[PDB]
Amino acid sequence: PTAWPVDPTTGQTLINGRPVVGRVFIMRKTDGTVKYPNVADVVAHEALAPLPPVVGSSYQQAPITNQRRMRGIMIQSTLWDMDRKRSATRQRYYPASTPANQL
């Protein structure tokens, strides 16, 4: 299954019951690559499908001081990960806001 039989007399490989002169190797294409058969075979090597999302049943607003002014989705990684200017940091969130009654 992994190698052909070897004649005990001569250390010589037997292919279909008859000796080969030389050192036998199992032929393969470049680096053992093999053409992908189909999508199903590719998918059968992967993890199973992801589970359904966990979605919140209702939305509670955060306090306004926890709401971002910038709606851009990557901004935390693309800018704020390197920008630490104090004034610019303060501008990232809405300031506190209170009904005049409560002051």
Ligand X SMILES: *[C@H]1O[C@H](CO)[C@@H](O[C@@H]2O[C@@H](C)[C@H](O)[C@@H](O)[C@H]2O)[C@H](O)[C@@H]1O[C@H]1O[C@H](C(=O)O)[C@@H](O[C@H]2O[C@H](CO)[C@@H](O)[C@H](O)[C@H]2NC(C)=O)[C@H](OC(C)=O)[C@H]1OC(C)=O
How crowded is residue 52: how many other Cβ atoms within 10 Å of its Cβ?
6
Closest residue to ligand X, judged by C-beta, is 56
Task: Verify binding: residue 54, ligand X, rule CB under 6 A.
Answer: yes
Cβ atoms 19, 12 nearer than 8 A: yes
Selected binder of another protein within 3, 26, 81, 98 (CB under 8 A): 81
Q: Residues 11 to 50: which contact another protein by CB under 8 A?
A: 29-36, 38-39, 42-43, 45-50
* In contact, 6 and 15? CB cutoff 8 Å: no
For the CA atoms of 69, 70, 74, 79, what is the dihedral angle to 10 degrees? -90
Residues forming the site for ligand X (CB under 6 A) = 54, 56
Residues forming the site for another protein (CB under 8 A) = 29-36, 38-39, 42-43, 45-56, 59-62, 66-79, 81-83, 85, 87-88, 90-91, 93
